[PDB]
Amino acid sequence: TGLLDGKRILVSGIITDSSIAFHIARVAQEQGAQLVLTGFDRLRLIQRITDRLPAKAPLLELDVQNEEHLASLAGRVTEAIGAGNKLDGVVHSIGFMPQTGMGINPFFDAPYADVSKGIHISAYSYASMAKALLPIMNPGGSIVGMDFDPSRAMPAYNWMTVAKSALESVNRFVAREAGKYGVRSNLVAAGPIRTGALGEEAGAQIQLLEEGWDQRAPIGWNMKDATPVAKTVCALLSDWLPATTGDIIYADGGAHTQLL
Amino acid sequence: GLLDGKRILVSGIITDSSIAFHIARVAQEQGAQLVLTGFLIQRITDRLPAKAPLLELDVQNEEHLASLAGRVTEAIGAGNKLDGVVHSIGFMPQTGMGINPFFDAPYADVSKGIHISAYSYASMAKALLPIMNPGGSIVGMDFDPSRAMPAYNWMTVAKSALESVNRFVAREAGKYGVRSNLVAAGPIRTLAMSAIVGGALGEEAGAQIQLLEEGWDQRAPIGWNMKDATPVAKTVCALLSDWLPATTGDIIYADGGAHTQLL
Amino acid sequence: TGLLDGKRILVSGIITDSSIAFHIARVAQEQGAQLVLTGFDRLRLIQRITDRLPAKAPLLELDVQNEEHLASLAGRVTEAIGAGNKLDGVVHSIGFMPQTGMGINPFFDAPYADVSKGIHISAYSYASMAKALLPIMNPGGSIVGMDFDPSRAMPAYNWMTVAKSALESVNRFVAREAGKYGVRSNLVAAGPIRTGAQIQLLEEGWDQRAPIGWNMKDATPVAKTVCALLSDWLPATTGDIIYADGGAHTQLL
Amino acid sequence: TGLLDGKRILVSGIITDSSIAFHIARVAQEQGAQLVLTGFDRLRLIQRITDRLPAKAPLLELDVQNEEHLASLAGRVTEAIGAGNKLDGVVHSIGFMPQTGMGINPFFDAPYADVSKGIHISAYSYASMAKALLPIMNPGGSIVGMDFDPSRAMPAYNWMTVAKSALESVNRFVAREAGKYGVRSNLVAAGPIRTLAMSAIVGGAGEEAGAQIQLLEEGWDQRAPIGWNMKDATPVAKTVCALLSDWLPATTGDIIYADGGAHTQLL
Ligand SMILES: NC(=O)c1ccc[n+]([C@@H]2O[C@H](COP(=O)([O-])OP(=O)(O)OC[C@H]3O[C@@H](n4cnc5c(N)ncnc54)[C@H](O)[C@@H]3O)[C@@H](O)[C@H]2O)c1
Ligand SMILES: NC(=O)c1ccc[n+]([C@@H]2O[C@H](COP(=O)([O-])OP(=O)(O)OC[C@H]3O[C@@H](n4cnc5c(N)ncnc54)[C@H](O)[C@@H]3O)[C@@H](O)[C@H]2O)c1
């Protein structure tokens, strides 16, 4: 008997087998969930990756910047799961920020066109996905999105931090709408996951930043392992956190609760 | 079950309306083997679906705390350890919460309230961590004290202290591969809460506590049922399980999402 | 002998005499500051409003969505204050969110083009203004922006709440850059000020929660708070938020 | 023509000229405030220290654990400032946690009697002082207490962190009461300042606690976008005076961070 036995769950965001969404999908299938997967742009490449999951699952195209894909999504999901069936879970594991808004580029040098594209994909799309899928979600259902704690500024993350701050606010509003359907909406704020290319300076800054989690975390933090993050997402998709919504669960080894 | 084969200590049962009674019931339904602590309680624990040894524990008693691990080992058998610990203990004299002005609470009463409600979370962890397995979990009960509110007064201060204690307990528990977290629940109609709504503290506090309570279901996007402790007991069992393995020194809100909404 | 004696301060965001920026400008002039004002679109109309201030101040055009206005801003400010002089303070009091993402319109019905415009003007522009003006700011200087506490969701504010959450994050990054110039960056989170039914109930719960009360018709306590941050009296506060809300955010009920 | 011209302000917590309260008192006097000072236990020693301030000020005894000192406080202050006059400001700059509740001693080994004494002095006393002084405070008045950000756990501060978490909660309740008098109540969360206790902890008086607190200080100046000078209490004293002034009239039950902005940055 699995944690998600009989649940129908949509999982977005698989691009490689290192994607957090790949591990979420794997754990959900191990726990008896029946999945529907969504992918962006390189669909034939994504299918070769989803072939590595323990079970078969239909793969649907979804570019969150495409209004036609969003308008047809519910109909395409209904065709995949069968008429009369609805989703119990939705996973948003999508993020993007051009190199001008994240990395080595000065914070002030990111043009708004790049920042806006990043915010569209990383934050606004959480509301777009909920709008498209809530009409085909069962009561007791659960929408989960991926977050990286943006309460404090940090080197390199720059405008992606701003996109996460916007995402946390979007999640609180999505919870108000999802509540009308008896559906929960929450984010999982993960520690860094290893999903010299940017030089010596940024490479060192990012290494110190990332090594700080394992030192601060009372139970440690393994950047090579997405499984504890995938398990946390599955806990929110389950019936075991039924009174949590518009909220953030931290799967970061407890690093955010410690100063040093 | 979610907790199949897990050995879990549950404190805080006094009546069958206690949040700890519901936590214990759900944990047994989910396959856990329990050890109960109390400080008349055996007649209540007889109502649980399965038998469980009941040990005496007054958290203000240093002798009870010093002997606790040995008494638990005797109950579960030599060579066996605990996988979970539940702290569901709270107390504040009437001088520190209710109708009494905030400034009129003498320190002796506030201190006793803080000892039982906050310091004892560290005391319980100190006594039980030496007999806990790696991957283990310690969970305590909280009521969001980030903002002041009518009547809760010094109990709000005790919860603010408890949240801080939890972050330090996580540092110690980490050495054993054990997590420590609090569940911040919405209001639940336990014995005291039903008496206050019933008018035991008068018309003024009765009305203030009723507005405090009604605003909760209004703010919660999924609603809030103060008569039902099951969503809170399920949340505690989620933290006792292997499904939140990277969460520690933290707070999970089982409040219908009320704390995320202004209006 | 005022709080801001001799300080050169830029103030954006005046449109009417009920604008929070109008009250900030008035209090700053009363406290001895020499101002430079910026306005958007209706400059002749804005000019007539700024004549109501106690002292004369040059008015410059600034549409924060206009890259040419931003590129020329420092030069235009230098012409207004004189060569060799720099700013000690910058006030960002700008916000906008198209009707689809604010009010009665469902949260899900706001198209991204409207949300993006709102975020550009309300949040990204705080970084744009700091980028343009930090090269003409003196050490010990202060950048202040206006915020409305977005830590919890609420009725009607909808996508403007999302823009404020983005603004708070932008402020923390602007502080990292401003620090290089010995300049502070902070936001003032104000209670509601008079500048449908749900907006009235939301706005009114504020005076109820506030331990010192809240007067939505009076912008002076907010203007005084902004001037406190522009002064030399909060020299160790940056990337932060000061709440001028009657203490409403500290109380549940 | 000072920021606090004509204001009558009570300042507690002076023990040495390194005390944050000494710098608060100095800046307040430079800004035209008329002070009343309170001292604990070593009053002859405290009088020699307060002699170093730019202006004379009456020194009153106040042990916050002493109910008789608290009951007589308002009358003693009234006698010092003159009948018919009231206070405009109150500064709480008091803290203590017995040795077992800090540094080298394991967090689990601090007995409750020590923790309770520490909480009494460091948190409950903020309510005690407000209870005693609000009846002799003018509208527009301000109560300010000193805090050290306890939102996250950290090495060595141990039970003193717990006392600060309790203090932040007490401040929110004090604001509800102070509001009835038209009085504000707020805390200033300061960055680390090399006072006598701070220098001793870094000095190893355990080695491990000294090493961790050295790391805490280094990181603070690193994280702070405007930097942090632990040898300079003046920015902290200025922030307290800003709250005592008429320039933050709509802020109450709140926390102002005078920490160089370090709490707003991860790295
Ligand atoms: N990796 C970490 O350290 C970390 C930490 C915390 C949170 N997260 C978050 O987890 C999520 C997944 O990131 P990841 O680390 O697995 O990286 P990833 O590159 O594997 O996943 C990002 C996904 O976004 C998809 N995407 C981009 N543009 C899209 C569009 N227009 N339409 C639809 N999908 C689009 C990509 O195709 C990809 O599958 C993101 O939200 C990320 O911010 C990551
Ligand atoms: N609305 C609510 O009921 C509510 C909301 C959120 C959290 N909580 C928390 O949940 C926990 C349980 O409260 P409850 O509502 O079930 O009430 P309860 O009265 O049933 O439980 C409190 C328990 O504390 C025990 N206790 C008191 N002093 C003790 C001592 N010296 N030693 C050992 N145990 C002692 C009592 O015996 C009792 O079992 C508390 O921490 C409470 O603050 C309750």
Ligand SMILES: NC(=O)c1ccc[n+]([C@@H]2O[C@H](COP(=O)([O-])OP(=O)(O)OC[C@H]3O[C@@H](n4cnc5c(N)ncnc54)[C@H](O)[C@@H]3O)[C@@H](O)[C@H]2O)c1
């Ligand atoms: N009024 C309140 O209740 C309240 C509460 C908290 C914070 N605030 C904030 O204070 C600020 C000022 O708002 P207000 O209430 O004074 O209203 P306002 O309408 O008087 O001012 C908003 C200003 O933004 C300007 N603006 C719009 N588009 C612009 C553009 N492209 N370029 C430059 N400027 C542009 C407008 O011209 C106007 O001057 C905003 O950031 C607002 O969110 C207001």
Ligand SMILES: NC(=O)c1ccc[n+]([C@@H]2O[C@H](COP(=O)([O-])OP(=O)(O)OC[C@H]3O[C@@H](n4cnc5c(N)ncnc54)[C@H](O)[C@@H]3O)[C@@H](O)[C@H]2O)c1
């Ligand atoms: N030093 C720092 O790094 C730092 C940082 C942030 C906040 N603070 C806070 O500032 C405040 C002042 O501390 P400090 O660093 O200036 O140290 P300090 O030792 O100079 O001041 C502490 C004061 O508390 C007094 N006190 C102790 N027990 C008392 C009692 N029973 N009754 C009355 N007064 C009593 C002492 O006499 C002393 O004057 C404390 O609340 C402290 O926690 C200090």
Ligand SMILES: CNC(=O)CN1CCN(C(=O)C[C@H]2CC[C@@H](NC(=O)Cc3sc4ccccc4c3C)CC2)[C@@H](Cc2ccccc2)C1=O
């Ligand atoms: C058709 N409208 C237009 O042509 C342009 N226009 C003008 C006003 N407008 C704005 O963007 C105004 C702008 C909002 C942000 C900022 N003001 C605030 O932050 C103050 C608010 S507005 C609001 C609304 C609901 C709840 C709280 C608050 C609070 C605290 C500056 C002024 C928007 C949204 C709008 C539409 C109709 C009625 C009211 C608003 C807009 O579309």
Ligand SMILES: CNC(=O)CN1CCN(C(=O)C[C@H]2CC[C@@H](NC(=O)Cc3sc4ccccc4c3C)CC2)[C@@H](Cc2ccccc2)C1=O
């Ligand atoms: C032998 N000493 C005694 O009997 C009495 N005594 C005096 C000083 N004492 C206090 O409680 C001093 C008090 C602490 C709280 C407060 N100071 C601070 O909060 C400043 C600190 S101390 C510290 C330690 C670690 C991390 C941060 C900080 C910060 C920010 C006022 C002064 C304690 C603990 C102590 C002992 C020796 C050296 C240093 C401390 C104490 O036991």
